[PDB]
Scaffold this motif. Structure first.
Motif, PDB file in Angstrom:
ATOM      1  N   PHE D  52       0.804  -1.214   0.000  1.00  0.00           N
ATOM      2  CA  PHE D  52       0.000   0.000   0.000  1.00  0.00           C
ATOM      3  C   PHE D  52       0.841   1.270   0.000  1.00  0.00           C
ATOM      4  N   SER D  55       3.015   1.196  -6.223  1.00  0.00           N
ATOM      5  CA  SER D  55       2.097   1.405  -7.329  1.00  0.00           C
ATOM      6  C   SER D  55       1.707   0.068  -7.944  1.00  0.00           C
ATOM      7  N   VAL D  83      -8.185  -1.160  -2.444  1.00  0.00           N
ATOM      8  CA  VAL D  83      -9.487  -0.562  -2.162  1.00  0.00           C
ATOM      9  C   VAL D  83     -10.346  -0.588  -3.420  1.00  0.00           C
ATOM     10  N   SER D  84      -9.772  -0.155  -4.541  1.00  0.00           N
ATOM     11  CA  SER D  84     -10.488  -0.147  -5.809  1.00  0.00           C
ATOM     12  C   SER D  84     -10.637  -1.556  -6.366  1.00  0.00           C
ATOM     13  N   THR D  85     -11.849  -1.890  -6.814  1.00  0.00           N
ATOM     14  CA  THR D  85     -12.068  -3.194  -7.427  1.00  0.00           C
ATOM     15  C   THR D  85     -11.347  -3.303  -8.765  1.00  0.00           C
ATOM     16  N   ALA D  86     -11.425  -2.255  -9.591  1.00  0.00           N
ATOM     17  CA  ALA D  86     -10.763  -2.283 -10.891  1.00  0.00           C
ATOM     18  C   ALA D  86      -9.257  -2.474 -10.748  1.00  0.00           C
ATOM     19  N   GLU D  87      -8.639  -1.808  -9.767  1.00  0.00           N
ATOM     20  CA  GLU D  87      -7.208  -1.996  -9.542  1.00  0.00           C
ATOM     21  C   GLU D  87      -6.910  -3.419  -9.089  1.00  0.00           C
ATOM     22  N   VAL D 106      -7.280  -8.364   0.447  1.00  0.00           N
ATOM     23  CA  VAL D 106      -7.766  -7.865   1.721  1.00  0.00           C
ATOM     24  C   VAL D 106      -9.135  -7.233   1.498  1.00  0.00           C
ATOM     25  N   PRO D 108     -11.734  -4.589   1.190  1.00  0.00           N
ATOM     26  CA  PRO D 108     -11.517  -3.163   0.926  1.00  0.00           C
ATOM     27  C   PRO D 108     -11.772  -2.349   2.183  1.00  0.00           C
ATOM     28  N   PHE D 109     -10.907  -1.365   2.413  1.00  0.00           N
ATOM     29  CA  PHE D 109     -10.820  -0.681   3.691  1.00  0.00           C
ATOM     30  C   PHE D 109     -10.946   0.830   3.499  1.00  0.00           C
ATOM     31  N   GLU D 117     -21.320  -5.444  -0.744  1.00  0.00           N
ATOM     32  CA  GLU D 117     -20.294  -4.801  -1.555  1.00  0.00           C
ATOM     33  C   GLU D 117     -18.956  -5.519  -1.438  1.00  0.00           C
ATOM     34  N   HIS D 121     -17.060  -7.307  -4.650  1.00  0.00           N
ATOM     35  CA  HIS D 121     -15.634  -7.044  -4.812  1.00  0.00           C
ATOM     36  C   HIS D 121     -14.873  -8.344  -5.032  1.00  0.00           C
TER      37      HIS D 121
END
Ligand SMILES: [Cl-]
Ligand SMILES: [Cl-]
Ligand SMILES: [Cl-]
Ligand SMILES: [Cl-]
Ligand SMILES: [Cl-]
Ligand SMILES: [Cl-]
Ligand SMILES: [Cl-]
Ligand SMILES: [Cl-]
Ligand SMILES: [Cl-]
Ligand SMILES: [Cl-]
Ligand SMILES: [Cl-]
Ligand SMILES: [Cl-]
Lengths: 298, 297, 297, 297
Positions: D52, D55, D83-87, D106, D108-109, D117, D121
Motif C-alpha cells: 500500500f 504502485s 481498495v479499488s475493485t478495478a485496480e 484484503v 476493501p478498507f 459490496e 468485490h
C-alpha cells in the motif's frame, strides 16, 4: 493571522465519473461552477469525499488541474494530496503547487500503525514539496484510525507550514480545547451533522460533503450564529440532518451524486467499485430532495 | 406535563467524613449551597454521588436528608439505579416515600443485558416509583450500552418515563432525538460540551461540575436564549479550563476539595479505591475556589 | 509454594428459588455435584455467581455454605471483589473466618481508577485476608481495564498475590505472562479457548461451563499432557458446541437450566434484570442434560 | 480440490534500495532464501510486502519476479487486494499471466462498504483471476471489518474461494470456522499465537516473521503432529522473544534488518513514512541474525 484567507465554508468536492468509471471532466467543471454559484468560500479537492483512495495519482492530478482552471482567482483552492506513501503525497503536493492551489492537505497516513514522529516527518516532507503554500493537517480518529492527544495536536498545528486543521471529530470538548490553545488557528468542522454545534465549540469554518447540494444552508447557520438567532441555526441544522439521514440510508457519496444528477449538474452519479450503485427504491426520494433544494434556492 | 423537570441540576456529591462515613452536616450544607446558586433541581445518588460504593441503606439516608432540605424549594430527582432490579425497586419505593419529584436509573451494567431486559428493568422501577416519573439513561461510555435511535424511542415512550439523561458526546444523536421528540425533557450529560449540547437539542443539564460553578452553566442557558453566542463560548471556555484541572486531579475528589476550600464540605475525601488528592495540586484547587467565590459576588 | 491452586475449578453459579432468594439446598447440591466431577477446586462469588446482584450478607452466606461442603476436600477460592475497597475487605475477612484457601477480587470497575489505585485496592484486600493468597484479575472485557505487561508484573508480584485469573482471549499476552513468570498460577478465563489457552501458558482454568461438563476440560488437560492433540481438539469442539447453545439461550440461565434437568438445581432462574429462558429453547437444553448425564455414566 | 494451498508460507517482504525503488536483486535472493527454508509457498504483495506504498506497476513487477524464481518450486499466492475493485482486477489478471497458484485480496478498507459490496468485490476479482482460487481475508484489526460467522460462511462459499486468511486473535471464531468447514484451507494470521492457532483449527500460517525463522514454525507443525506439546510451547516461546524485539524496533524494518545482516537484502529500508531503524537497536538485531544463522546449521 497570515493565512486568514483559508477560513469559511468549503465543499468537499466530489469526483464525477462516467459510465465506465473514468473521470467525467465535463461534469467536474459544472460541479465546480455550481459550488461557486452557491457562494462557497473555497473548494476541497481530492479528499475522502472525492474518492481519492480509489483513483490513481495521475487521475488525482487530472482533477486538481481542472478545478484550478475553473476556480483559481475566484474561490480558495485546497488540494488534498494525502497518501499512505510520503513520496506519492509529495508528488501531488508539487503538482498542486504547479497548478496554483492556495493550500494543500494531507490525511494522517493510515492502515499501517505509524508513530507520531513518523506522522510529523510525513507532513514535513509534504510541506517541503508544497514549496510555500500552507498545509491543512488532519485529525480524523474515525476512518483513518489515528487517536491523537491535545499536545500532539498542538505539535502538528505548530509545524512550520501548517496553517489550518481539519477537525473530523465529533468530540467537541477537544474542539474547544484546540480553539482555547490556538486562538488564531483555522479550524474546519469535519462532520456536517454537528456543524452548528461544531462552530459554537470553536470551529470557524467547515469542510463537508453535503455542501455540494446545500451549501447555502450551512452558510445560513454561520449567519444565524453571528446574528444571535440560535433558533434559526437549530432549524437549519434540523433540515440538514433530515438530508443526512437520507444520505446515510442510501449511501452518502452516491446519494449526493444522484441529487446532483437530478439537478442536471452531473451526467452520471456513479461511484467507483466496490461502491455499489443506488438502489431503485431510493430514486424517488432522491429526486424529490433535488426539487426541494432547487426550489429552496429561488 | 412534566416541564418542571427541565433545567440545570447538579449531580450531587456525597460528602464523607475522615473515616469515610456519610457527613450529614456537610451534605445538608451542600444542598443549601446549590439551592443558593439558583439551580432548577438536584440529582441525588448518581455516579457523581459515589452510589456504587455505598450501601442501599446509605443511599436511602442521603435521599431522605436531601428531600428534607430541598423538597418544596427545588426539583428533586433520585437516582435509584442498581444492577439488581429488586435493589433498584427498593430505592424507588424509598424515594416515593420521601416525596421525590422523579426517579432515575442507569442502564444495568457489567453484565450484558438485552434491550428488552433493560425495558423490563425500567418497568419494574417505574412500578415501585408509584406515580413519579422516571428518567432513563443513554450512557454508552461508562455503563457500556450502545443504543439505537429506534431503541431510544422505545425507552422515552415507556409508560412512566418523563425525561432522558443523554450522557453522550454524539450531538448528531442529540439532534435526532430532539427532532423525533420535540417535547422530551433532554439533559446534556457531559458538562464539557454543555453549550454545544443545548444547541444540538438538549433543554437542560445534569453535571457534577455544577456543584461549584452552577451560575456559569445557568449563564450559558441565558446567553443562548438572548442570542449571545460569544458570551456562551466564553463561559464554556472557563468551564472547560476548570474541567481540564479536575481531570488532572480527579474529578470527584477535586470538586469536593474546591467545596472544602469554599467552606462547604469539612472533608473532601472520596471512598477507596479512590485515592486522595496529591499535595502538589492543593494550591491550584485552593486558587480555583478563591476565584469562583470572588466571581460569585 | 502455593502450587495447590493449579487446576480446573468451576466458577460456581448461585442458585435461587421461586422468589429469587438464595437456594441454600440447591447450592449444597451443586458443590457436591462438582466434587463428584473431580474438579480441583471451586471459585465462589464470582461474576458467574451473579455476585453483583447480591448483597454482602448474601455473598457471605454462600461462602460459608460452600466452605461447609468442600473445605478439606477441594480447593476453596472466594471472590470477594467489589467496587468499594471496604466492602471487598469485609468479604475477605469473612472468607478468612470460613477457612478459604485463597481469595480473589475483580479489578474495581465502572469508575476510572488509576493503576496505582488498583494496586492499593488489592493491598487492602490482601491485608484483610490475613495470610491467605490473592488471585488478581486481568479482565479487559467486562470490567474495562486494559493493562500492560509491566503492569501485570507489578500485580502478580505484589506481596500476597499467588495467581492470576486471565480472562482475556489475547494468547500472545498469555504467552508473555508465562515467559515472565514461569511458576505463576495462571487460570484461563474463557472456556471456549481452553485448549489453546493451556498451550499458550495457562496451567488451569476457571469457567462457568465446568459446572455441567468439568470432565471434558479435565480430559483436555490430560490429552495435552499425553500428546493426543487430536483428543484435545475434539473435546474443545464439543465444549464449543455447548457454548454455542449457551450463548444463544443465555449462559448463566442456560447453565442453571441444564443443572435443573440434571436434578441439581430446583429453580434455574437468574435475578432480574436477567430474564428467564425462552420456552422455545427448553427442548434443546433438556436434550443436552441427558447427553451430559449419559456421557458421564 | 485446493489441498495444495495448505502449509506455512512467509508473507514476502518487498526489498527497496537506498532511493526506495524496488531492489530486484535482493528480492530474488529473498525468494531463494525462503525456498531454502523448506516453506510450502510464498505470499507476495501483501500487507507485509508494503503493497500500500507501492504502485500497481511496482506490485506487478514484484509478482512477475517472484513467479520466475518460485513457480514450479513452491506454491505461489499473489495478494491483488486494493481498495479499488478495478485496480484489484488488474493485478488479478497479471497474476494469471504470470502463473500464480492463487490470488488474495484484503477486504476493501478505509471506506465503510456493506457486506454485499465486499462479496461483489471478491466476485469481480475471482473473474479476473480467470480460474485460480481466491484467498479471502477476515482481518478485523488493521482493515477495520468486523464479520460474523454466517458472513464468514458466505465468503468462503463464494464460487472461486479456496482458502481463508484468518488474521484474528479470536480463537473461538477460529474453532467455529473449522467446525463449520472441515475441509477449509485456513491460515493463521498472527505469528505470536501460531501454535495455539493451529490447535484451534488452522492448518497453516501466513506470517511476516517466517522470512527469518520459518523452520521454527514448520517445527511447531511437526511438534503438534508428533504430540510433543512441550516442544511446541518452547518453539512458540522462542518465536515470541523475536516478535517482542521486532515490535520494539518496527516489525517490517526489523525483519529486513535481520535479513540484511544475513546478507540476503542489501538495503533494509521500508518506504516512508516508515522511519529507519534506530541505531541503538542495531546491536540486538545483528545478534539475532547471528543466532538464527547458527541455529539452522
Ligand atoms: Cl474529504
Ligand atoms: Cl499513534
Ligand atoms: Cl461564531
Ligand atoms: Cl442547474
Ligand atoms: Cl451522576
Ligand atoms: Cl434520618
Ligand atoms: Cl439447606
Ligand atoms: Cl466468575
Ligand atoms: Cl448455616
Ligand atoms: Cl431436586
Ligand atoms: Cl500480508
Ligand atoms: Cl494439527
Amino acid at each position: 493571522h497570515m493565512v486568514s484567507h483559508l477560513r469559511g465554508v468549503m465543499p468537499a468536492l466530489l469526483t464525477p465519473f462516467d459510465a465506465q468509471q473514468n473521470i467525467d471532466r465535463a461534469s467536474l467543471r459544472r460541479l465546480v461552477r455550481f459550488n461557486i454559484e452557491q457562494g462557497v468560500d473555497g473548494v476541497y479537492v481530492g479528499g475522502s469525499t472525492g474518492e481519492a483512495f480509489v483513483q490513481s495519482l495521475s487521475e488525482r492530478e487530472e482533477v486538481l488541474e481542472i478545478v484550478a482552471e475553473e476556480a483559481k482567482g475566484k474561490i480558495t483552492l485546497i488540494a488534498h494530496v494525502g497518501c499512505v506513501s510520503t513520496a506519492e503525497s509529495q508528488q501531488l503536493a508539487a503538482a498542486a503547487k504547479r497548478y496554483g492551489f492556495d493550500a494543500v492537505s494531507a490525511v494522517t497516513p493510515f492502515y499501517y500503525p505509524f508513530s507520531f514522529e513518523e506522522h510529523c516527518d510525513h507532513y514535513r516532507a509534504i510541506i517541503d514539496s508544497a514549496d510555500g503554500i500552507p498545509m491543512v493537517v488532519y485529525n480524523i480518529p474515525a476512518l483513518s484510525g489515528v487517536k491523537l492527544t491535545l499536545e500532539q495536536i498542538n505539535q502538528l498545528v505548530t509545524l512550520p507550514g501548517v496553517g489550518a486543521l481539519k477537525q473530523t471529530s465529533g468530540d467537541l470538548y477537544q474542539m474547544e480545547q484546540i480553539r482555547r490553545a490556538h486562538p488564531e488557528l483555522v479550524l474546519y468542522n469535519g462532520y456536517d451533522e454537528i456543524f452548528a454545534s461544531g462552530l459554537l465549540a470553536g470551529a470557524d469554518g467547515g469542510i463537508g460533503s453535503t455542501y455540494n447540494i446545500m451549501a447555502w444552508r450551512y452558510l445560513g447557520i454561520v449567519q444565524a450564529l453571528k446574528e444571535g438567532d440560535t433558533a434559526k441555526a437549530q432549524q437549519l441544522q434540523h433540515e440538514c440532518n433530515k438530508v443526512i439521514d437520507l444520505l446515510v440510508k442510501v449511501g452518502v457519496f452516491r446519494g449526493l451524486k444522484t441529487v446532483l444528477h437530478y439537478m442536471d449538474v452531473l451526467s452520471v452519479p456513479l461511484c467507483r467499485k466496490p461502491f455499489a450503485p443506488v438502489e431503485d427504491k431510493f430514486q424517488a426520494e432522491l429526486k424529490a430532495l433535488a426539487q426541494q433544494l432547487m426550489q429552496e434556492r429561488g
